[PDB]
Structure 1
Amino acid sequence: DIIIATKNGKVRGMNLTVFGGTVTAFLGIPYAQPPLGRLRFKKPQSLTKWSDIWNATKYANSCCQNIDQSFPGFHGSEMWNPNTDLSEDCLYLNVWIPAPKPKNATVLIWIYGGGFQTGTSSLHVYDGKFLARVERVIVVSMNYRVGALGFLALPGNPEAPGNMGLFDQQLALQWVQKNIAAFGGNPKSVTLFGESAGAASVSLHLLSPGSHSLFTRAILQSGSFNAPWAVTSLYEARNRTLNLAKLTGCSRENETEIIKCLRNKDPQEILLNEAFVVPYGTPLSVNFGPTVDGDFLTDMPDILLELGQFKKTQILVGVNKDEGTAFLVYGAPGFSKDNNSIITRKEFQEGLKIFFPGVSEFGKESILFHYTDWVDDQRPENYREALGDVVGDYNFICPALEFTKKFSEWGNNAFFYYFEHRSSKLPWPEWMGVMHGYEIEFVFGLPLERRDNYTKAEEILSRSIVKRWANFAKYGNPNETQNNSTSWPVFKSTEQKYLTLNTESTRIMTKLRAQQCRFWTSFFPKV
């Protein structure tokens, strides 16, 4: 039996066996007041203590979110669906401490991605027990409000001020500050890591003064705040909150009145209107996301980033070889999960209208013009691969590289990785390649379980990546100093070096997607 005295109640956790050892898990510890009724759409509220001992022995509630019903019965899309029960009462977090209890362990806080609309910490691919046993770190992950319940914004009005899901994560960060010493953790050695919208969340903690004292280092996997989907403007958030209010018949005009209307509406009524708040939509739509609230974010994040207004520390950033394929099968002509998905120049042209709906016909031609200069025209996949590269480059790879350059320019060590290994278990067809999201399994060390149908090489790669991530969390340098490994060099603005990750040969390369990222990061913003 393991009880831990936290500053507001005793907490009892389980024991697991992992590769012939013990890891103590504490699943579902509450860190915030249930944000129900009158606390809905508000920042998370402190907690009231309990002399009751709490049984943190089961994954808690995922927060309210629509679910991916696009491929019923498909492991590829349903593995991202929530695996506990939806509820507004969902502001819990999990902890994983090694056994024997560590003395001063480094802490890894996971922040799940999605599109600020979906996600939960209880998914199998985020199971922190492997990292706790293999590397003797402490893994903490938390649930945070997503969708409108987490990011509906009426600016300045404290009844719905925006960025509630970010203050959820931030509050879970202070919990780890106040309590992780009781678990044998070092609050002065804390690394945030995250994927997709979790990665964009990690970058915004870098920019938010209230979070600066609550972590040490940052890891950003396939995402950053400067990605075109990650920050919704002050005007977009107004039209989007009014349109949601109309679509619930809550169109008051006293501002705090049209919120009290939504507080009484049903969570399911809000989830179903959410989709229809913007006219034209994309598979990368983020209808309620982070805004400039003047509290978590004091200014437009790209100004803060360009003018050096962020925590000075180490960052580890990277992307996958085919970030963009996943989004094609959710609404691009000729694209399907069961079809090798060769498309025509006209289908490629139609795909551009889908993903860049507001862009002019000039911009849609620029994209066509630049991405289409291959050599061999007698090969079918040109346009198919082209669109995946288009979407992956625009939405993830080029912003991620841009964040890393601007961050490194103020004298911080940055490390960039190019993850290019296709999962031997990947449920999606092979034409989709190394997909968005499908490096996470390797960070959490799932292939370290031999009874799991991963390659023995996938065990080696995942072991290597786990060590590189743990060395970065502990020591700020993501090297593997023992198995004759490729040295991972710093990313500097001048030469822009990055490490590739795969099972064949890990290489140092420079200037990843150099021509493409110039087109996106310099020319296209003028368009």
Structure 2
Amino acid sequence: SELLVNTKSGKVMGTRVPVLSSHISAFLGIPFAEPPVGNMRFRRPEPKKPWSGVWNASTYPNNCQQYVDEQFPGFSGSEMWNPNREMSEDCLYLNIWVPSPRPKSTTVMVWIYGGGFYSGSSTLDVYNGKYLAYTEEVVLVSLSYRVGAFGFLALHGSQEAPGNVGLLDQRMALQWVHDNIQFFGGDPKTVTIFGESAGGASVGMHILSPGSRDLFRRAILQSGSPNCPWASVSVAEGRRRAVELGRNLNCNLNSDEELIHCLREKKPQELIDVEWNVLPFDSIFRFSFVPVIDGEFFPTSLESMLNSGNFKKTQILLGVNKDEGSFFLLYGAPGFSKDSESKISREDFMSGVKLSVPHANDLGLDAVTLQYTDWMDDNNGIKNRDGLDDIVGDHNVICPLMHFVNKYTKFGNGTYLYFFNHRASNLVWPEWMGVIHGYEIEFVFGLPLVKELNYTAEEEALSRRIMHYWATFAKTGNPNEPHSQESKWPLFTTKEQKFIDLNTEPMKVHQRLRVQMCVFWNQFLPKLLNAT
């Protein structure tokens, strides 16, 4: 049967799924690691023990234990990101959408969900890979990994909670795809990993980590990069947060052994209820448990690795959205609201600046304020609002990504940069948020092809154009069709530094994406805070 596949771990029974008045195979909930439960909490993942009989891969697996956003109960804009299936520490599974009839050796794309390393699910509606698998004839795989303390609590030195275990879960999945994807018609030698936000940072981290490089061919990073200020913490900071988490749960803190044992006796939701109490500063776009620069998964500092070229050299495609910072300002900055235009007073602007650059002293804060304030009209509430949006977006996503792309392109084998700036006609979020963080995903996964979702024709066209760029790139290392008559997405070079806009209008090529502001965040500000 086409829905039956035998793998090195055992046999799995898929399920026929309808997609755009057609059908393809879907293998949901395939286990790739032993359930990281009990004394295994915080530990490195163990490979899933082979099973006898047939594994029922007809329905989505559980979602990992995580904080659930209840900021707007019933609101689809926020709940579409929440876990849509029961939560459980037993959540290490992956999903595969296979074209019908089953291919023999077609391109493979592996999706790594974002969510600040504190949340995320591979089962979300917006991540359904049947449209991309069907439309582009690729084997679409979506993995899962532990988030929150469960996947990133870090007590470097200890082996019961070394940290980065969530990254290792991802690797374990990539390893499984490498070893078994062939049986589903996929080519293990043409696997492209791609993810957004923390998933984008994850992708970059696998490009950097020696132990992950050989498990994939190419990479796509969407609004995320390994060097993002929120993507990692030092060994010391990780430890401090783990201890503080223990302090929040009335744990014995005499030793890592005692601390870890206590955290392991606590129920999932217990750790999640106090998770946000460990942050060092009052800030936005900062998450408690994230990857740690341990000297193992990451040999040395990310910056020294990028400088020295200590990373996988291949082709990459990446980009950002126009309004990367609007999302987090709405959730934490004073003066922002979901149902108002959120015009920001100068007082709230100042408060917002301090929340956005937590590690900054007075001089630094002044530097930022000056850089983003129009002193000819400093009380303009819209300019203040949009100003904060740019600060949060430039500081947390765009500039870090631009630093990464410029450093990688030095040793890489081909770079393709994009700037996504189209606002969905059916977006349910307020207009002031613009082209929101993560809203390019629905176009990447082909949602605009489903008439019932109420997208416009032009948007359906953009989605198809994007899906084909991603798929053609994964397959060839170039998003463009060899001898095509359509506009060519130029290669990003150290010299020209070209990129394209991704919207519904005819393609346009630009250069030096956000160069002015990124010189400030990547070169000047760091130097200032360090000198002072």
In the TM superposition, residue 272 of structure 1 has moved relative to its aligned partner by 1.1
Structure 1-normalised TM-score? 0.98
In the TM superposition, residue 381 of structure 1 has moved relative to its aligned partner by 1.3
Counterpart for residue 161 of structure 1:
162
* Alignment partners' CA distance in 2, 1:454 and 1:469: 20
- The letter of the residue matching 1:281 is D
Counterpart for residue 53 of structure 2:
52
> Equivalences for 1:427-438 in 2 at 5 Å?
427-438=428-439
Counterpart for residue 257 of structure 1:
258
In the TM superposition, residue 233 of structure 1 has moved relative to its aligned partner by 1.1
Which secondary structure does the structure 2 equivalent of 1:88 belong to? coil
* Alignment partners' CA distance in 2, 1:387 and 1:239: 30
CA contact (8 A) 2:345 2:379 kept: no
In the TM superposition, residue 295 of structure 1 has moved relative to its aligned partner by 2.5
Which secondary structure does the structure 2 equivalent of 1:399 belong to? helix
Counterpart for residue 463 of structure 2:
462
In the TM superposition, residue 87 of structure 1 has moved relative to its aligned partner by 0.3
Which secondary structure does the structure 2 equivalent of 1:316 belong to? strand
* Alignment partners' CA distance in 2, 1:491 and 1:54: 45
In the TM superposition, residue 374 of structure 1 has moved relative to its aligned partner by 7.2
* Alignment partners' CA distance in 2, 1:405 and 1:94: 34
Q: Deviations over 1:93-115 (max 9, x none)?
A: 00011001011111100000010
Counterpart for residue 345 of structure 1:
346
CA contact (8 A) 1:156 1:294 kept: no
* Alignment partners' CA distance in 1, 2:255 and 2:458: 62
Counterpart for residue 525 of structure 2:
524
* Alignment partners' CA distance in 2, 1:228 and 1:262: 27
* Alignment partners' CA distance in 2, 1:176 and 1:464: 27
* Alignment partners' CA distance in 2, 1:242 and 1:479: 50
Counterpart for residue 404 of structure 2:
403
Which secondary structure does the structure 1 equivalent of 2:27 belong to? strand
In the TM superposition, residue 482 of structure 1 has moved relative to its aligned partner by 7.3
Counterpart for residue 322 of structure 1:
323
Moved more, 461-470 or 73-82: 73-82
> What RMSD, in angstroms, separates the aligned Cα atoms of the two structures?
1.4
In the TM superposition, residue 368 of structure 1 has moved relative to its aligned partner by 0.9
* Alignment partners' CA distance in 2, 1:178 and 1:185: 11
Q: Deviations over 1:77-104 (max 9, x none)?
A: 1111110110000001000110010111
CA contact (8 A) 2:252 2:258 kept: no
- The letter of the residue matching 1:10 is K
Counterpart for residue 282 of structure 2:
281
Which secondary structure does the structure 1 equivalent of 2:319 belong to? strand
Counterpart for residue 239 of structure 1:
240
Moved more, 73-82 or 474-483: 474-483
* Alignment partners' CA distance in 2, 1:314 and 1:208: 16
* Alignment partners' CA distance in 1, 2:508 and 2:360: 37
Q: Deviations over 1:201-244 (max 9, x none)?
A: 00000011111110000000000011110011111111111111
* Alignment partners' CA distance in 2, 1:481 and 1:379: 49
In the TM superposition, residue 480 of structure 1 has moved relative to its aligned partner by 4.6
> Equivalences for 1:247-396 in 2 at 5 Å?
247-373=248-374, 380-396=381-397
Counterpart for residue 130 of structure 1:
131
- The letter of the residue matching 1:227 is C
* Alignment partners' CA distance in 1, 2:376 and 2:175: 54
* Alignment partners' CA distance in 2, 1:74 and 1:255: 41
- The letter of the residue matching 1:434 is V
Counterpart for residue 171 of structure 1:
172
* Alignment partners' CA distance in 2, 1:281 and 1:106: 45
Is 2:184 the counterpart of 1:183?
A: yes
Q: Deviations over 1:261-316 (max 9, x none)?
A: 21111111111121111242323121110002233222221211111100000011
CA contact (8 A) 1:222 1:396 kept: yes
CA contact (8 A) 2:132 2:140 kept: yes
Alignment CA distance shift 1:243-1:380 (3 Å): closer
Aligned residue pairs: how many? 527
* Alignment partners' CA distance in 2, 1:468 and 1:98: 19
Alignment CA distance shift 1:403-1:11 (3 Å): same
Moved more, 433-442 or 259-268: 259-268
Counterpart for residue 412 of structure 1:
413
* Alignment partners' CA distance in 2, 1:374 and 1:446: 43
* Alignment partners' CA distance in 1, 2:215 and 2:304: 23
CA contact (8 A) 1:315 1:413 kept: yes
> Where in structure 2 are there 5+ consecutive unaligned residues?
none
- The letter of the residue matching 1:420 is N
Counterpart for residue 116 of structure 2:
115
> Equivalences for 1:67-78 in 2 at 5 Å?
67-78=68-79
Moved more, 37-46 or 442-451: 442-451
Is 2:505 the counterpart of 1:504?
A: yes
CA contact (8 A) 1:442 1:466 kept: yes
In the TM superposition, residue 380 of structure 1 has moved relative to its aligned partner by 4.3
CA contact (8 A) 1:21 1:99 kept: no
Counterpart for residue 213 of structure 1:
214
* Alignment partners' CA distance in 1, 2:21 and 2:71: 39
Which secondary structure does the structure 2 equivalent of 1:381 belong to? helix
* Alignment partners' CA distance in 2, 1:167 and 1:324: 29
In the TM superposition, residue 179 of structure 1 has moved relative to its aligned partner by 0.6
Which secondary structure does the structure 1 equivalent of 2:491 belong to? coil
Q: Deviations over 1:102-139 (max 9, x none)?
A: 11111100000010000010001111111111010001
CA contact (8 A) 2:500 2:508 kept: yes
In the TM superposition, residue 505 of structure 1 has moved relative to its aligned partner by 2.4
Which secondary structure does the structure 2 equivalent of 1:330 belong to? helix
- The letter of the residue matching 1:405 is N
Counterpart for residue 199 of structure 2:
198
Moved more, 387-396 or 492-501: 492-501
Counterpart for residue 25 of structure 1:
26
* Alignment partners' CA distance in 1, 2:451 and 2:508: 27
* Alignment partners' CA distance in 1, 2:339 and 2:524: 36
Moved more, 374-383 or 207-216: 374-383
Which secondary structure does the structure 2 equivalent of 1:143 belong to? coil
- The letter of the residue matching 1:292 is I
* Alignment partners' CA distance in 2, 1:192 and 1:73: 33
* Alignment partners' CA distance in 2, 1:457 and 1:52: 48
Counterpart for residue 472 of structure 1:
473
Structure 2-normalised TM-score? 0.97
Alignment CA distance shift 1:268-1:394 (3 Å): same
Alignment CA distance shift 1:358-1:70 (3 Å): same
* Alignment partners' CA distance in 1, 2:483 and 2:18: 27
Counterpart for residue 10 of structure 1:
11
Alignment CA distance shift 1:280-1:376 (3 Å): closer
Alignment CA distance shift 1:269-1:376 (3 Å): closer
Which secondary structure does the structure 2 equivalent of 1:210 belong to? coil
Moved more, 515-524 or 254-263: 254-263
In the TM superposition, residue 65 of structure 1 has moved relative to its aligned partner by 0.5
Write out the 4+ residue segments of structure 1 that deviate beyond 3 Å after TM superposition. 373-380, 480-484
In the TM superposition, residue 51 of structure 1 has moved relative to its aligned partner by 1.4
* Alignment partners' CA distance in 1, 2:294 and 2:377: 50
In the TM superposition, residue 387 of structure 1 has moved relative to its aligned partner by 0.5
CA contact (8 A) 2:194 2:221 kept: yes
* Alignment partners' CA distance in 2, 1:65 and 1:411: 36
* Alignment partners' CA distance in 1, 2:51 and 2:494: 51
Counterpart for residue 65 of structure 1:
66
CA contact (8 A) 2:323 2:437 kept: yes
In the TM superposition, residue 375 of structure 1 has moved relative to its aligned partner by 6.5
* Alignment partners' CA distance in 2, 1:406 and 1:458: 33
